[PDB]
Amino acid sequence: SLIAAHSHITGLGLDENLQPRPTSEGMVGQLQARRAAGVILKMVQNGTIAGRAVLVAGPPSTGKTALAMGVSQSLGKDVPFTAIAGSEIFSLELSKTEALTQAFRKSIGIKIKEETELIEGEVVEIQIDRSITGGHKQGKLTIKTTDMETIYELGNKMIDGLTKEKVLAGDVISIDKASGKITKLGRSFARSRDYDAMGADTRFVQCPEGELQKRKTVVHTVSLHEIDVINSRTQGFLALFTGDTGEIRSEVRDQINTKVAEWKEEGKAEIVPGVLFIDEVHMLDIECFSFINRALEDEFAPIVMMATNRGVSKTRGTNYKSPHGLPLDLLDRSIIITTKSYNEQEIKTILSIRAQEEEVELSSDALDLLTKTGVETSLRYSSNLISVAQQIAMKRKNNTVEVEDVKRAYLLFLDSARSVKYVQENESQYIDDQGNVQISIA
Amino acid sequence: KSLSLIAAHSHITGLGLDENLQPRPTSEGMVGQLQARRAAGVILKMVQNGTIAGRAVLVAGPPSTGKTALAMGVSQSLGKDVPFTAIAGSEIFSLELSKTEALTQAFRKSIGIKIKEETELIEGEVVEIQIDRSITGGHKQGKLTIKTTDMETIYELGNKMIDGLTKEKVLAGDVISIDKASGKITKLGRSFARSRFVQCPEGELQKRKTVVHTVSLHEIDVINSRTQGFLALFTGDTGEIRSEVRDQINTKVAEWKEEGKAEIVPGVLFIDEVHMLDIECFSFINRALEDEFAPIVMMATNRGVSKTRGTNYKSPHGLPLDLLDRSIIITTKSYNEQEIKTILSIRAQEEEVELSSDALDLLTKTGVETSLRYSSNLISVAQQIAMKRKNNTVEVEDVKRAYLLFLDSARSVKYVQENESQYIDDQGNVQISIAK
Amino acid sequence: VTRTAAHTHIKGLGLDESGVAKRVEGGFVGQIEAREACGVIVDLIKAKKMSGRAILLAGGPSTGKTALALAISQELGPKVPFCPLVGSELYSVEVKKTETLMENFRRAIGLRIKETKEVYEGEVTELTPEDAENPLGGYGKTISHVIVGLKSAKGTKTLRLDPTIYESIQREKVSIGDVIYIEANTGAVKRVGRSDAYATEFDLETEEYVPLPKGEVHKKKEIVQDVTLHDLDVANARPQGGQDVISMMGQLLKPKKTEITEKLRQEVNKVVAKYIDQGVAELIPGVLFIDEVNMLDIEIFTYLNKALESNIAPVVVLASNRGMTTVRGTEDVISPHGVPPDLIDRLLIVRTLPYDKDEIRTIIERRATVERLQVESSALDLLATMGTETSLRYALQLLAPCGILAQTSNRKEIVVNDVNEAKLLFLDAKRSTKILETSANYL
Amino acid sequence: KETKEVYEGEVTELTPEDAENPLGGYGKTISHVIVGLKSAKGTKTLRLDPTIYESIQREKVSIGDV
Amino acid sequence: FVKPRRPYNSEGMTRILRRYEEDLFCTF
Amino acid sequence: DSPFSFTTFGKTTSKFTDLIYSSRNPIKYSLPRLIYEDLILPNYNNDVDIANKLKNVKFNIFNPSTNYELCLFLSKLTGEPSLNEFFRVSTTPLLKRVIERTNGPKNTDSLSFKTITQELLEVTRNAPSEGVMASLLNVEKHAYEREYLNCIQRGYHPNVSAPPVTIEVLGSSHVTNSINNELFDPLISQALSDIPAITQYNMHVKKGIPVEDFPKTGLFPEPLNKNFSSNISM
Ligand SMILES: Nc1ncnc2c1ncn2[C@@H]1O[C@H](COP(=O)(O)OP(=O)(O)O)[C@@H](O)[C@H]1O
Ligand SMILES: Nc1ncnc2c1ncn2[C@@H]1O[C@H](COP(=O)(O)OP(=O)(O)O)[C@@H](O)[C@H]1O
Ligand SMILES: Nc1ncnc2c1ncn2[C@@H]1O[C@H](COP(=O)(O)OP(=O)(O)O)[C@@H](O)[C@H]1O
16 A cells, blocks of 8 residues: 555554564554553453543544554554544534444444355256346356356346356356355356357356365454344435434343344444544533543443543633543542653664655664654654655665755755744734735835 | 322412401411412402403512412412413513514413303113124115113114224223214213223203313414414424404404403413513513403513613613503512511421421521522421431431522622632632642 | 343332431442432332332432432333433424424323133135126226135134235235235234245245134134333324325325324323223322433423423423523523522422442442452452542443553452552543643643 | 456347257247347347346337437 | 145236247246 | 334224224314315315416426427537427426336437446446445445344334325315225325236236336335334234
């Protein structure tokens, strides 16, 4: 795909004793935060307990979302990771409580075990009996292998399966009964007399030998939010993709919880917990916090990881300052991970890792001056300067970024403090807070 | 019918007044407030005469002093077949209806039209049915014999009543009411034959009965709006009924009243906690109160020199003075110890609670000390403590245990002021830890 | 084996026959006066006579208010309906908060019913429809009647279908060689599946096979259903289930909450009254729980002042943790617990008290028992002095990192060095606030 | 990017050929459909599937159309 | 003993046969 | 396990047995005769029909007899070869415009062209599998067949099922015929159903009615599973 901001991290980089290495899996430094994240990862992988809120706090450009996405990468497949921003809750279709309920229910996973029958063979006879209007469709199918020969009965969805990507009595097809998948493997008959209607170049296959019908235990992972969207109304599968699911009633969720408990008792399904990650949680109303206050105390709740770069500040919807932008009720029932700022060698190793991720070769002195700029200014400016210096490097037709390219990139593109100083030296040129601006240069 | 467990004003069955509009000391479950009860009786005769309309009455007083009790007494003494709409101040801030449109709906819901019509019905006891059918069922003939406790008959039926009898299947021994005009078959039940259960009807088989119909203005406004049917009366999506349809309804009710086929009954609209309305609602109300088809509006409030919502100034009772010029005000007062004791005795007889006399005096003392509602709420808890120790009569220490267990307002304010360090203040500061 | 989350160690109030609460029994520690008051209100709702009774649970954070409501819910049992709610749930974008308030008010009144069902069931043997004389006349259906032959155990019945019944026959896609279920109250039809009287493995549509149904074709069975008044209200508001046009067109439309008028509620109440007078239904009042009532605003409180005076409202329980807090939606007035005094006058406040060191220690001990964890005595004393030092909840949620850090050292017990590692790894509120005050760039 | 194999032009003849062994209880059983097409400096007859004639009848294809 | 097949009953309906060597379309 | 039937129907107090649909709502909205006669149905003393004509036909802005220039303008806009189509659109309800929609031809010299999204839609009707446009346009059925959704069970059922509220008027049959026509409209109910195959064979061959003169059927959306097609659980 495309090289993103967090494309250099594959996992957390931890030992078997949960001791993080100083340079592993794209992570350097942040040893205590990575240790706490590995503890919370083993807690989620254990899956015994639920409803615990984790806070990652620190200054901007420190590694909050990098740590959260590394937790997601080490979490692996078939475990849900709902990563939403804090601004997504404010909507004109769903209430804040309903949107947060959906965000909670998206992170709880149901693994259902199903039994399948696989049919593969050379087809002999297909008879399709349709009505005049084409509504009532029934049929017979004759499938064979080298040893057996069976004649089946066809339904509407099966006939619509055979109608698409048409099978012409001599192709080898694959049918899953529980899934309804029609997969034409190829053609073995090799009929000489073919009409000039289709440009088929179907590869020659061989007619399969042995047992025609075989059993297979299959499994799949689904989550609760699509379950109560499906059970909500008649066309829940379309509302799953259009997102047009407006305020599902409480009886639907109650009966879905009862059915999930029954499925856990019967051994058909087991619940796999996941993690809901709310990036930049300080932009939430106090109603959202008061709903989270109760919704963290349910059995059907995931581990909530919330990140805040704010210090002591005013909570939204109120008129008092609070630590981390959150009321003390949420800080009463949450354990907080605190991140710390970086050093010279950590920033240099971060720039080396990002340059190897961006396949841009850097010289030693260029790396030193980039680390100098990332110590003086922030880390993100020195991160974003690399591709610009690379473009300057092939602009002079050499695949090595020296001092002069990074110096030219430094002159061409401005910082935050440099832009603040250049605005404040020329305040009459810009539109001020009072809306007065001097346009004429005379 | 009309299921109800026990309500707060369920002991009030009407205004206790004599034929000269004078209040009894204790009648129909109401004590105290003699002049307020006299004024509400004047309002009752004002509505019962019905010759005037569009008069607004404000009921103001201290909280927990006989306001909603007075309105419930007026509603109970009005009786049936008179429209009575009881809304709150917060029921008009809708998201699909506007505030003035909702006020127009609440105004037109309290004016009814009395219609008298007759419909001949056949109701009797089914003895024997005969059904003859062909192979294709094209021609059907049938005999129905049916009876009362007085007469006997046999009826030859056409094919459509045959189809309407095999639908909603009528057997022998059944009591059926038959409508000739619309073909509606209603099964009242089975009669008294041991071989549910109802009695066999008496008198004539083909009875002509009249009925007295009541229909509000709002029902005809919903029906005559062709964009939605009569399902909007139940679903509630009337959705901004226009004005020309209201003009047609207002002309046609006068056209019906001049021909004598209908009569208009006026009702009472009660807007409880009227101080929670916005200024734009009151501004609609001053011009809505001068209509011909406007009811008598009863409004209750308890605020005193409060800020009117939607403005920035303060007004008496939360209402601006232009509205107060169009209103006549009934004022209630506080209660003595004897009236509180009488109210508590009435609520004790109502909830089937047996008391000791010293416990009643203790309840009267703690009622005149703290609140009437606190004493009226402890009287149900103390009965449960009395049944927890297996005795019927509620004694003094039974009330004392409920007083110790269950808290009142001012005591709770006192411990909040004492232990405010463990609570969340207005600034969001709390202390959780017990040490340091 | 099992899953727990901050609760479910509370099983009930844990009282005697006389209502006297013990010290530690049933997962509860202390709070004897509050537990006795909760036993009183549990006996009150079990008395099934009162309507519109309200209490408020007053206390600090982490003192056991919601635990008391859950204990009330488990002491009442699953049969009496319990409606948990949060003060922020009343704000809907679809419908005003007044209708949401009586939405949850009518959701908390239970009802049983004993309903007779007229059932035709069996195996279909033949499917012969007959046609009309003129089908393209515009008015009237294409067919007139459909003959169905139902076969069951010891009996065979032949029925003449209406066309309207035949539409709901066709929509579930029946055929000869099937088992069906005609339900005559609504015309609803269940396709039970293919019978085992024919072959089994010759299908391709993952069907399941049902034996021939016992008993006669025509039946009358008794079914006990538990129901609320709210389900009746929303079924009559959006009518689905019939065999008309509107019944199909309501099942395909988007469901949306609507402002239910009082007239349908009065008619539904009259129908429930005529059901309870014939000895079929029995009325179950319930408990409505609103946590964080301070987040309710002034018009919801003003409407609740009317809602408590109805003759159908259930027992409502409120909870708050504010001392001297102005009401939301107003500008200047200050009232206790964020609840205006005209509603405070209708309440029965229940105090909740904080705990001591030994109560925190035995709560942590029972919690570590419930999550199947083993603690040393010195580590338990360190957890208790931390729970007195910072908060009960911080010590309560710190024990699962002690379990993980004890597991990762191939150990079973929890030691003091392990607790110190969990101390250094995870922070609390006070240390984070001290870090925020001594911070360089809003760290 | 994609590859399309198309046939287009004015229809010259349109005759659904019958089968050598017709089935009882039915009418005009079809073994194949013969359609002739003409265009600019090109004319070529086709041999089609029998089910295609149903789509020809639904799309209302007479003689002399493109 | 073997258990008999479900009755196949298709009256007044079109038919499509796909053999090895030739296809059919029995219509009305 | 079934929803509670909030209905009253004909029950038996116990060569064929005929069962007729008779489900009604227990809630009855009783309405007088005077309102229905004097405000809905026209008579000599009211002007319902005259006002309906004057609002719908005479002063209709799409009338070709009076606004032929506007009809020509909209015909050049839409490219539709009939000028009376705007009148028929504006004067029939929604579902009547739905269920007899015919894909008629529009002339090329017009301004309503083919939208790129509509062209992307129209490409992939009869396109088979392993085509790039079809596979890019068939995400939802791929998710249907991969998540094994066609064999899933049903977990939620409604608690109460009720018919619509029956309005009764004592002493009039016209209201009964109107209500029966509105509840059981044969055109819509035929659109929400299908014709039996032997009945179709009696239409086409034995009676000579062609296929395109059939009433439109089969517009009901299919349920997700066979289990989701009903509310009664075994
Ligand atoms: N330990 C680390 N390993 C890899 N990248 C890091 C690390 N710490 C910080 N970063 C980089 O710094 C940035 C941190 O900002 P962000 O992820 O938004 O979290 P926060 O806002 O908490 O600092 C990310 O873009 C990430 O690429
Ligand atoms: N005259 C009276 N007779 C009987 N009960 C009364 C009387 N006045 C007040 N009450 C009781 O006092 C309580 C408060 O009355 P209400 O009018 O509803 O409150 P408010 O005065 O705040 O509107 C009610 O429960 C009612 O039973
Ligand atoms: N009496 C008690 N016994 C055991 N645990 C308690 C007791 N009281 C409170 N707790 C614990 O304290 C936590 C907070 O209780 P809860 O009522 O849910 O919130 P709050 O007390 O803040 O309203 C709960 O998780 C519960 O485990």
